[PDB]
Design a protein around this ligand. Structure first.
Ligand SMILES: CCCCCCCCCCCCCCCCCC(=O)OC[C@H](COP(=O)([O-])OCC(O)COP(=O)([O-])OC[C@@H](COC(=O)CCCCCCCCCCCCCCCCC)OC(=O)CCCCCCCCCCCCCCCCC)OC(=O)CCCCCCCCCCCCCCCCC
Ligand SMILES: CCCCCCCCCCCCCCCCCC(=O)OC[C@H](COP(=O)([O-])OCC[N+](C)(C)C)OC(=O)CCCCCCCCCCCCCCCCC
Ligand SMILES: CCCCCCCCCCCCCCCCCC(=O)OC[C@H](COP(=O)([O-])OCC[N+](C)(C)C)OC(=O)CCCCCCCCCCCCCCCCC
Ligand SMILES: CCCCCCCCCCCCCCCCCCCC(=O)O[C@H](COC(=O)CCCCCCCCCCCCCC)COP(=O)(O)OCCN
Ligand SMILES: CCCCCCCCCCCCCCCCCCCC(=O)O[C@H](COC(=O)CCCCCCCCCCCCCC)COP(=O)(O)OCCN
Ligand code: HEC
Ligand code: HEM
Ligand code: HEM
Ligand code: HEM
Ligand SMILES: CCCCCCCCCCCCO[C@@H]1O[C@H](CO)[C@@H](O[C@H]2O[C@H](CO)[C@@H](O)[C@H](O)[C@H]2O)[C@H](O)[C@H]1O
Ligand SMILES: CCCCCCCCCCCCO[C@@H]1O[C@H](CO)[C@@H](O[C@H]2O[C@H](CO)[C@@H](O)[C@H](O)[C@H]2O)[C@H](O)[C@H]1O
Ligand code: FES
Lengths: 383, 124, 61, 85, 71, 54, 244, 111, 110
C-alpha cells in the first residue's frame, strides 16, 4: 500500500487534496473555494506581517500605519495587499455563495456545509469590520461608532453592552486595542470553520453543475483540479496586481487617510463596500431594533434555503423560471449595495424599502412558489 | 418536496379541463426551454437521489433501466465538461422521455408515508 | 455503436508525430517555462516580502 | 452518500466502453478557433436573456431614481422636494 | 502671464457660450432682487451657484488638456 | 533534440536544476531589461535625469 | 444633496504621473517643494516627511542636509538636565509652523490648516482636487452666496466657503530653474509635490507592477496551455454503450 | 458668558445665563418647537445651561451668541438654537442634548 | 515514533513561544535575555551577524524586535496547537501506550 494512503497524517492530506474524488464536470465557478483559500492565506501572511509593524495604541495607530507605508521595506505593498485582498475576499465569497445558491449546493445532503458556511460569512464580516477600525482614520472611528451603537438597540441591556464592547464611554484606545487582538484572532477561528465546512462536505462530495450524482464518474482532485485552479489563481493575481500596484486606493475611502477626530463628523458615514447591502437593509426599517434584526435576518435567512426550496431537482441549470428569479435576486442584491452608499434622500428612501422587501420575499415567498410550480411543469411537461 | 406531492398535484391539474387547457401547453414549453433533453437526459434522471427513499427506488430499478440510466448520466457529464450539446440520437426525443423512475419512487414513498401514518394511530 | 474493438474516431486530435522526442520535449518546455517563471516569481515575492523585516528607513537613519 | 475509489457508490455499471488518448498524443488546442467563436457564441446566446432582463431592469430603475434625486436637489425641484419631505 | 486666464475666457465666449449667458442672466436677476427691499425678510433667497457650476464644469472640460499642455 | 531531452529533461533532478538555473538567468536579465525600458519611457522625468544639475 | 454641498468636482488634468508606466516628473516635484516652502509652509505642516525623504527625489544629500542644518530641533537635556537645541539632521522631520492646534486656529480665524502629507490621498480627486482648489478662487463669489466671516468662496471646496484665502499669484515664487512662476504653473508643481508626499513609493510601485503584470501574464498563458494539455484525456474521452 | 468644557472629548457649552436671558427662554410656546421642551426640563438650575455643544443636525459645533434666537447658530447648515438651547430654525431635528450633570456644590458641577 | 517526533517539535515551539513572550514585558531581563539569546545566532558562520540584524529589525534589541515578537508570540501558540493536534492524530493509529508496555488491544475502556 502506497505511503500516502498508509500513513494517517499523509492520508488526511491525500483525502483532501490529491485522491479526493471530484465530479469530472466542475465549471469555473467551482474555483472560488480555492481562491478564498488563497485570499485567506494572503491575509494571514500580510496580516501577521503588518502586525509586526502596527501599534495598537490609539495615540500611535494611525501613525504606525503611515510608518508602514513610508518606512518599512515594501510596507506599502504589504499594506495595500492586505487592504485590497480584503475586498477580493468578499468578491470571492459572494461568488462562492452565489454559486452555491444557483446550483442548489445548500440542498440535502449538503445542508451542513452550507450552514457552517453561513457562520463563516458572519465571521468574515466581523473580521473585516474590526480590521477596518485598526487604521483609526476618520472612517475607522465613525464606522466603529455607528456600528457599535446598533447594539444599543438590544432592550434593557443594550447601553451596558455597548460600553462593555468599547471598554469606555466612546470609541477610543480600549476599543482599538481590543479590536487589534480580536482581529488577529478571528481569522484563525474563520480558518477552523472553513476547514469544518470542508470536512462536512466530504461526506457527500462536491455538487456539480448538472445537479445529478457524480458517483458514476469521478476524477482525482489532482492533477485535474490542481491545474484548473492555477488558471484562476493567475487570473486573480492579475486582478490583484492591477489594484495593488496601479490603483491601490480605488476601493478605499479617502476619509480614512485623515486621522480619527471625534469632533469632526465625516460627510457621509458608510461601511466598506462589501457591507453596503446589509446597511441598506438596516436603513429600510424605521425602527432602530427592527433595523438591526432585519440586518441580521438578511444573513441568517440563508439558513432556511434548504427548507424553502421545494424543488425535486437540485440547482438552476435546468430551471428557466428559477434562473430568471435568481437573476433578479442577484441584481436586487447589487441595487441594495448601491443604495447603501447614497444619501438618505428621496427617492432612494422608498426604493431602498422596496428592494428590501424584494430581498426577503425571494426566500419567503417567491422561491417556495416558483420551485413548487416548476416541479409541476417538469412532471406535466414530460408526460 | 415529495414526488408523491408533485404527482398528486399534477393529477388535480390534469383532471380540471380549464386548468389542463392552460397548464399543459405552458409545461410543454417550459420543458423545451429547460433544455435537459439537449444533454440526453430523461426528466427523471434529474430528480435528487441523495435521500434514503430515492436510494431505495433506484435499487428497485430493473437492471436494464439501471444500466441505461448510468450511461445517460455519464454521457451527460461528458457533454457538460466539454461544453457541447447532444446531437442526433443522443438528444432525448419527447417519446423517449418516459417516467421510468416515478412508479418506483411512488411505491417507496407510499410505504414510508403509510408507516408515518400508522406510527400515529390511536385505537378508538 | 456496437463493436468495442472499433476505436472511436480520434483523428481530429491525434498528433502525427506523437512518439518523437521533439513532441514530448515541447510539452516539457511549456511545463518548464511555467516552473521557471513560478520560481522567479516566488523568489521575487519571498525576497521583497521578507525584506519588510530588515531595518526600516527610520531605523537605518 | 459518496464512498471512495473502488466503492464510490455508483449503481453497477456494465456495457459502457470508455476510450481516450494520451495528453502527449493529442493536440491540446484542437479546434480551439471553432470553439472560441462558434461554441462561445452558442453558449452566450442561450443564456443572454437571463442576464440582460434583470440587468436592464435594475439599471433602468437606478437611472430613474438617480435622475429624480438629482433633479429634486436643483432650484427647479425645490417644490417637489419640499413635498417629498 | 497666467495661461489659464486666456484659455478660460476663450472657452467661455466659444464652446460654453450658452452656459455663460445662463450665469450672466442669473446674476442680473439675483442682483436686481437683492436691490429690492424686504429681500432680507424673504423665505427663499436665490443664488447662482448652480449656473456657475454648469459654466465651470463646461469650461474645465474644454480647457484642462489645453492648459496642462502649455506648462 | 533527443540529446536535449536526455540531458536536461529526462532526469527530474536535471530538469529542476535547469529550471532553477533558468530562473536565475531570467531574474537577472529581466531586472536589467525592465530597468532600461523604464528609464526610456520615463526619460527626463526621473531623479537620475536631473541629478546632473547638482 | 445640493451640488454646492458636495463641491464642484475637479477636472481630470493630464498629470505626468497618470499612466500605468509614468513616473512623477521630478523636476516638477522639486519646483513644487519650493512652492510648499515659500507659500504653504507658512500655515501648513508636512509632518510625515523627513529631510531624508527629499534626497534622491528632489534634492541631493547635500542640499537636504543644508535645509536640515538651518533649523533648530529639541536635543536631549544637558548634564544639568536643562533643555537644549541642536541643528537638524536628515533623519529629522520637516517642522510645522505652529506648536499646536490652538495656535494654528488662532492664526487662521478659527480654521485649522490640515497637515498636507496625506492630503492628496485624503480628498476625492487627489492632485486634481488640489490643483482645482488652488486655482479656483473666482474674483467674485456667484451672486447670492453668503460667506461666513473669514471665509472665501471656492466652488471646489464642499459648501463653497473655505477658510484658506487665495495664495498663489503670478510671481510669488521665483523658481530657481527659470520656469515662469504663473498661478497655474505653481499650482501644478505644488500639487505634484503633494501627490508625491502622499505616496512616495509611487514610482517604484509602478515599476514593480510592470514586472508583475508581465510575469503573471506569461504564467497565466502557460497555465492555460498546461491545463488544456493535462485535461485533454478527459475532454477527448469517447464512449460506446451496448445495453446488456 | 458661555464656556466650552471637554467631556468625553465632546465639547460642553456652559452658559452663565442672566435673569433676562432666562425670561427670554421661558417665553416660547412649547407647541411651536420641533423638539417640544421647556427650559425647566432642560436645566436643573436656571442659571446653568449645560449642554453637549454639538449640533443635532450633522455635528458641527454652533457658534454661541450668534443665531436669530440669539443662542447658538450652527454655521454649517444654518440651524439656530435658543438660550435654552432649543432648535428654532434650520435643518437640525432636536434640541442640544443635555449631559447627566449634578451640582455637588453650588459652585462646582460634575458631568 | 511519529507522535514522539512531532512531540519534539512541539517542545521546540513551546520554547520559542515562551522565550518571545518573556521579551514582551520589556523589563531588564526581557531585554538582556533577548540580547544574549539572539546573539547566539551570530555564531552561524558567514551569515550569522546578518541574520541577527534581520531578527532584531535593527542593530540592537529595540522597538522593531519587540513589535515583531508580539506578533509572533501571538501566532506561535496557534501553531503549537496544530502540532499538538497532529501528534494526537498520529498517536491514534497505535493507541496510547500503557504502564505495562504490553498491548491493550485485549482490554480497552472508553
Ligand atoms: C474574481 C477573481 C478573478 C478570477 C476569475 C474567476 C472567474 C471565473 C468564473 O467563474 O467565471 C468564468 C465563467 C466561465 O465558466 P465555464 O466553466 O466556461 O462555464 C460556466 C458556465 O457553465 C458557463 O455557462 P454556459 O456554458 O451557459 O455559457 C454562458 C457564458 C459563456 O461562458 C463562457 O465560456 C464565457 O455566457 C454568458 O452567460 C454571458 C451572458 C450574456 C451577456 C451578453 O464564465 C461564465 O460562465 C460567465 C457567465 C456568468 C454570468
Ligand atoms: C448578474 C445576473 C446573473 C444571473 C445568472 C443567470 C444564469 C446565466 O446565464 O449564467 C451563466 C451560467 C449558466 O450555467 P449553467 O450551469 O446554468 O448552464 C450550463 C449550460 N447547460 C445548461 C447547457 C448545461 O451560470 C453560472 O455559471 C451561474 C453562477 C452564479 C454566480 C453568481 C454571483 C453573484 C453574487 C451574489 C451573492 C449573494
Ligand atoms: C511556489 C514555488 C514554485 C517552485 C517551482 C520551481 C521548480 C519546480 C518545477 O518547475 O517543477 C517541475 C518538476 C517536474 O515536472 P513533471 O513532474 O511534470 O516532470 C516529470 C517528468 N520529467 C522529469 C521527465 C520531465 O515538478 C516537480 O518536481 C514537482 C515540484 C513542484 C512544486
Ligand atoms: C503559485 C504557483 C503555482 C504552482 C507553481 C508550481 C509549478 C508547477 C509546475 C510543475 C509541474 O507541472 O509539475 C507538477 C507539479 O504540480 C503540482 O504538483 C501542483 C499542481 C498545481 C498546484 C496548484 C494547486 C491548486 C492551486 C490553487 C491554490 C489552492 C488554494 C490554497 C491557497 C507535477 O504534478 P503532475 O501530476 O502534473 O506530474 C506529472 C509527472 N510526474
Ligand atoms: C504574499 C503576496 C502574494 C502576491 C504576489 C504578487 C506580486 C508580488 C511580488 C513582489 C513584486 O513586486 O515582485 C515583482 C515581480 O512580480 C512577480 O514576478 C511575482 C508574481 C509571481 C506570482 C506568484 C508566483 C509565486 C508567488 C508566491 C509564492 C511564495 C512562497 C513560495 C516559496 C518585482 O520585484 P523584483 O523582481 O524587483 O524582486 C526582486 C528580485 N529580482
Ligand atoms: C495663510 C494661510 C494659508 C496659506 C498660505 C495656505 N493655506 Fe491651505 N488652508 C488654510 C486653512 C485655514 C485651511 C482650512 C480651510 C477650511 O477648512 O475651511 C486650508 C486648507 C487647505 C487644503 C484642504 C482643503 C480641504 O479640502 O480641507 C489644501 C489642499 C490646502 N490648504 C493646500 C494649500 C497649498 C497647496 C497652499 C499654498 C501653496 C496653501 N494651502 C496655502 C490656510 C492656508
Ligand atoms: C473562507 C471562506 C471559505 C473557504 C476558504 C471555502 C472553501 C471551500 C472549498 C475549497 C470548497 C470546495 C470546492 C468548491 O466548491 O469551491 C467549498 C465548498 C463549499 N462551500 Fe465554501 N468556503 C468558504 C466560505 C463559504 C461560505 C461563506 C459558504 C456558504 C455560505 C460556503 C459554503 C460552501 C458549500 C455549500 C460548499 C459545497 C459546494 C459544492 O461543492 O457543491 N463556503 N468551500
Ligand atoms: C480574513 C482575514 C482578514 C481580513 C478579511 C482582514 C481585513 C482587514 C481590513 C479590511 C483591514 C483594514 C485595512 C486598511 O484599509 O488599511 C485590516 C487591517 C489590518 N489587519 Fe487584517 N484582515 C485579515 C486578517 C488579518 C490577520 C490574520 C492579521 C494578523 C494580525 C491582520 C492584521 C491586520 C492589521 C495589523 C491591520 C492594520 C494595519 C492596516 O490597516 O493595514 N489581519 N484587515
Ligand atoms: C502542548 C503540548 C502537548 C499536549 C497538549 C500533548 C497532549 C497529549 C495527549 C492528550 C496525549 C494522550 C494522553 C497522554 O498520554 O497523556 C499525548 C500523548 C503523547 N504525547 Fe503529548 N502533548 C504535548 C506535548 C508533547 C511533547 C512535547 C511530546 C514529546 C516530546 C509528546 C509526546 C507524546 C507521546 C509520545 C504521546 C503518546 C504517549 C502514550 O500514550 O504512550 N507530547 N500528548
Ligand atoms: C485541505 C488541506 C489539506 C489537509 C487535510 C485537511 C484536514 C482535514 C482532515 C481531517 C478530517 C478527517 O478526514 C477524513 O479522513 C479519512 C482518511 O484521511 C477520509 O476517509 C476516506 O479516505 C480513506 C483513504 O483515502 C478511506 O479509508 C475512507 O474509506 C474514505 O472515506 C475521510 O473521507 C475524511 O473525511
Ligand atoms: C530560505 C530563503 C532565503 C532568505 C530570504 C532572504 C530575505 C531578504 C533578502 C533580500 C532582501 C533585501 O535585499 C534587497 O532586496 C531589494 C528588493 O526587495 C533590492 O532592492 C532593489 O529593488 C527595490 C524594489 O524592487 C528598490 O527599492 C531598491 O532601490 C533596489 O536596490 C536590493 O537590491 C536587495 O539587496
Ligand atoms: S451641521 Fe449643525 S446645522 Fe447642519
Amino acid at each position: 500500500m502506497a505511503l500516502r494512503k498508509k500513513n494517517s497524517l499523509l492520508n488526511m492530506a491525500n483525502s483532501y487534496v490529491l485522491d479526493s474524488p471530484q465530479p469530472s464536470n466542475l465549471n469555473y465557478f467551482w474555483n472560488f473555494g480555492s481562491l478564498l483559500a488563497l485570499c485567506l492565506v494572503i491575509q494571514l501572511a500580510t496580516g501577521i506581517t503588518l502586525a509586526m509593524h502596527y501599534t495598537s495604541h490609539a495615540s500611535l495607530a494611525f501613525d504606525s500605519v503611515e510608518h508602514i507605508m513610508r518606512d518599512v521595506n515594501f510596507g506599502w505593498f504589504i499594506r495595500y495587499a492586505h487592504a485590497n485582498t480584503a475586498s477580493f475576499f468578499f468578491i470571492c465569497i459572494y461568488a462562492h455563495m452565489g454559486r452555491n445558491i444557483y446550483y442548489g449546493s445548500y440542498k440535502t445532503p449538503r445542508v451542513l456545509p452550507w450552514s457552517i458556511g453561513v457562520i463563516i460569512f458572519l465571521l468574515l464580516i466581523i473580521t473585516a469590520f474590526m480590521g477596518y477600525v485598526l487604521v483609526f482614520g476618520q472612517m475607522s472611528l465613525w464606522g466603529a461608532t455607528v456600528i457599535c451603537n446598533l447594539v444599543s438597540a438590544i432592550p434593557w441591556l443594550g447601553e451596558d453592552i455597548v460600553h462593555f464592547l468599547w471598554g469606555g464611554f466612546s470609541v477610543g484606545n480600549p476599543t482599538l486595542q481590543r479590536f487589534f487582538a480580536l482581529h488577529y484572532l478571528m481569522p484563525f477561528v474563520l480558518a477552523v470553520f472553513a476547514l469544518l465546512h470542508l470536512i462536512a462536505l466530504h461526506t457527500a462530495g462536491s455538487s456539480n453543475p448538472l445537479g445529478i450524482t457524480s458517483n458514476v464518474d469521478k476524477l482525482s482532485m489532482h492533477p485535474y483540479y490542481s491545474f484548473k485552479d492555477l488558471i484562476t489563481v493567475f487570473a486573480f493575481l492579475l486582478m490583484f496586481t492591477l489594484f495593488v500596484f496601479f490603483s491601490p486606493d480605488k476601493l478605499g475611502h479617502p476619509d480614512n487617510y485623515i486621522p480619527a477626530n471625534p469632533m469632526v463628523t465625516p460627510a457621509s458615514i458608510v461601511p466598506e463596500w462589501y457591507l453596503l447591502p446589509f446597511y441598506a437593509i438596516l436603513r429600510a426599517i424605521p425602527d432602530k431594533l427592527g433595523g438591526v434584526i432585519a440586518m441580521v435576518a438578511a444573513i441568517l435567512i440563508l439558513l432556511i434555503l434548504p427548507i424553502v426550496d421545494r424543488s425535486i431537482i437540485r440547482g438552476n441549470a435546468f430551471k428557466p423560471i428559477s434562473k430568471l428569479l435568481f437573476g433578479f435576486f442577484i441584481c436586487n442584491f447589487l441595487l441594495l449595495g448601491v443604495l447603501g452608499q447614497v444619501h438618505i434622500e428621496p427617492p432612494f428612501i422608498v426604493l431602498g424599502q422596496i428592494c428590501t422587501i424584494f430581498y426577503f420575499s425571494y426566500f419567503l415567498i417567491l422561491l417556495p412558489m416558483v420551485s413548487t410550480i416548476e416541479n409541476i411543469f417538469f412532471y406535466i411537461g414530460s408526460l | 418536496a415529495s414526488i408523491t406531492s408533485v404527482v398528486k398535484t399534477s393529477e388535480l391539474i390534469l383532471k380540471s379541463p380549464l386548468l389542463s387547457k392552460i397548464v399543459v401547453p405552458l409545461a410543454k414549453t417550459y420543458v423545451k426551454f429547460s433544455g435537459y433533453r439537449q444533454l440526453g437526459f430523461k426528466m427523471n434522471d434529474l430528480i435528487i437521489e441523495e435521500t434514503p427513499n430515492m436510494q431505495l427506488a433506484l435499487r428497485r430499478l430493473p437492471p436494464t433501466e439501471s444500466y441505461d440510466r448510468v450511461y445517460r448520466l455519464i454521457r451527460a457529464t461528458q457533454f457538460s465538461l466539454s461544453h457541447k450539446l447532444a446531437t442526433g440520437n443522443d438528444i432525448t426525443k419527447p417519446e423517449e422521455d418516459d417516467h421510468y423512475l416515478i412508479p418506483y419512487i411512488l411505491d417507496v414513498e407510499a410505504e414510508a408515508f403509510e408507516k408515518d401514518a400508522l406510527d400515529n394511530l390511536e385505537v378508538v | 455503436g456496437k463493436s468495442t474493438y472499433k476505436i472511436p474516431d480520434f483523428t481530429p486530435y491525434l498528433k502525427k508525430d506523437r512518439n518523437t522526442d521533439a513532441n514530448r520535449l515541447f510539452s516539457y518546455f511549456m511545463i518548464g517555462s511555467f516552473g521557471m517563471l513560478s520560481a522567479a516569481g516566488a523568489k521575487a515575492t519571498v525576497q521583497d516580502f521578507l525584506s519588510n523585516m530588515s531595518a526600516s528607513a527610520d531605523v537605518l537613519a | 452518500y459518496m464512498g471512495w475509489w473502488g466503492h464510490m457508490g455508483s449503481p453497477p455499471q456494465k456495457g459502457i466502453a470508455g476510450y481516450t488518448i494520451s495528453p502527449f498524443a493529442a493536440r491540446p488546442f484542437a479546434g480551439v478557433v471553432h470553439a472560441a467563436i462558434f461554441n462561445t457564441f452558442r453558449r452566450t446566446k442561450n443564456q443572454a436573456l437571463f442576464v440582460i432582463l434583470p440587468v436592464s431592469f435594475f439599471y433602468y430603475v437606478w437611472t430613474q431614481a438617480s435622475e429624480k434625486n438629482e433633479w429634486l436637489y436643483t432650484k427647479a425641484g425645490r417644490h417637489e422636494l419640499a413635498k417629498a419631505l | 502671464p497666467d495661461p489659464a486666464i486666456a484659455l478660460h475666457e476663450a472657452a467661455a465666449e466659444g464652446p460654453c457660450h450658452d452656459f455663460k449667458h445662463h450665469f450672466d442672466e442669473c446674476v442680473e436677476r439675483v442682483t436686481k432682487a437683492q436691490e429690492a427691499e424686504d429681500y432680507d425678510h424673504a423665505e427663499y433667497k436665490e443664488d447662482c451657484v448652480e449656473e456657475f457650476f454648469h459654466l465651470q464644469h463646461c469650461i474645465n472640460d474644454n480647457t484642462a488638456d489645453k492648459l496642462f499642455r502649455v506648462l | 533534440a533527443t540529446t536535449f531531452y536526455n540531458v536536461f529533461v529526462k532526469r527530474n533532478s536535471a530538469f529542476v536544476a535547469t529550471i532553477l538555473a533558468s530562473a536565475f538567468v531570467f531574474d537577472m536579465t529581466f531586472e536589467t531589461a525592465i530597468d532600461n525600458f523604464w528609464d526610456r519611457i520615463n526619460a527626463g522625468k526621473q531623479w537620475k535625469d536631473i541629478r546632473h544639475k547638482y | 444633496m445640493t451640488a454646492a454641498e458636495h463641491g464642484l468636482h475637479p477636472a481630470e488634468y493630464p498629470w505626468p504621473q497618470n499612466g500605468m508606466l509614468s513616473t512623477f516628473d521630478h523636476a516638477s516635484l522639486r519646483r513644487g517643494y519650493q512652492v510648499y516652502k515659500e507659500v504653504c509652509a507658512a500655515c501648513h505642516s508636512l509632518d510625515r516627511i523627513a529631510w531624508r525623504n527629499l534626497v534622491g527625489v528632489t534634492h541631493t544629500t547635500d542640499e537636504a542636509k543644508a535645509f536640515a542644518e538651518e533649523l533648530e530641533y529639541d536635543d536631549e537635556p544637558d548634564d544639568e538636565g536643562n533643555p537644549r537645541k541642536r541643528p537638524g539632521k536628515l533623519a529629522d522631520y520637516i517642522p510645522g509652523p505652529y506648536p499646536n492646534e490652538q495656535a494654528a486656529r488662532a492664526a487662521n480665524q478659527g480654521a485649522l490648516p490640515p497637515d498636507l502629507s496625506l492630503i492628496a490621498k485624503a480628498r476625492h480627486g487627489g492632485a486634481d482636487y488640489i490643483f482645482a482648489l488652488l486655482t479656483g478662487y473666482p474674483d467674485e463669489p456667484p451672486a447670492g452666496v453668503v460667506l461666513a466671516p473669514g471665509m472665501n468662496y471656492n466652488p471646489y471646496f464642499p459648501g463653497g466657503g473655505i477658510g484658506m484665502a487665495r495664495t498663489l499669484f503670478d510671481g510669488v515664487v521665483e523658481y530657481e530653474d527659470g520656469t515662469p512662476a504663473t498661478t497655474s504653473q505653481m499650482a501644478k508643481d505644488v500639487a505634484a509635490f503633494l501627490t508625491w508626499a502622499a505616496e512616495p513609493e509611487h514610482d517604484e510601485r509602478k515599476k514593480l507592477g510592470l514586472k508583475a503584470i508581465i510575469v503573471i501574464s506569461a504564467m497565466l498563458g502557460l497555465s492555460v496551455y498546461i491545463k488544456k494539455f493535462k485535461w485533454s484525456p478527459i475532454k477527448n474521452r469517447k464512449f460506446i454503450y451496448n445495453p446488456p | 458668558k458661555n464656556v466650552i468644557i471637554k467631556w468625553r472629548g465632546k465639547p460642553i457649552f456652559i452658559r452663565h445665563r442672566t435673569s433676562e436671558e432666562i425670561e427670554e427662554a421661558n417665553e416660547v410656546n412649547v407647541a411651536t418647537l420641533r423638539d417640544p421642551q421647556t427650559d425647566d426640563e432642560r436645566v436643573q438650575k436656571p442659571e446653568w445651561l449645560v449642554m453637549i455643544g454639538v449640533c443635532t443636525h450633522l455635528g458641527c459645533v454652533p457658534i454661541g451668541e450668534a443665531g436669530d434666537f440669539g443662542g447658538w447658530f450652527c454655521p454649517c447648515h444654518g440651524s439656530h438654537y435658543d438660550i435654552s438651547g432649543r432648535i428654532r430654525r434650520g435643518p437640525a431635528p432636536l434640541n442640544l442634548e443635555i449631559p447627566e450633570y449634578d451640582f455637588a456644590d453650588a459652585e462646582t458641577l460634575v458631568i
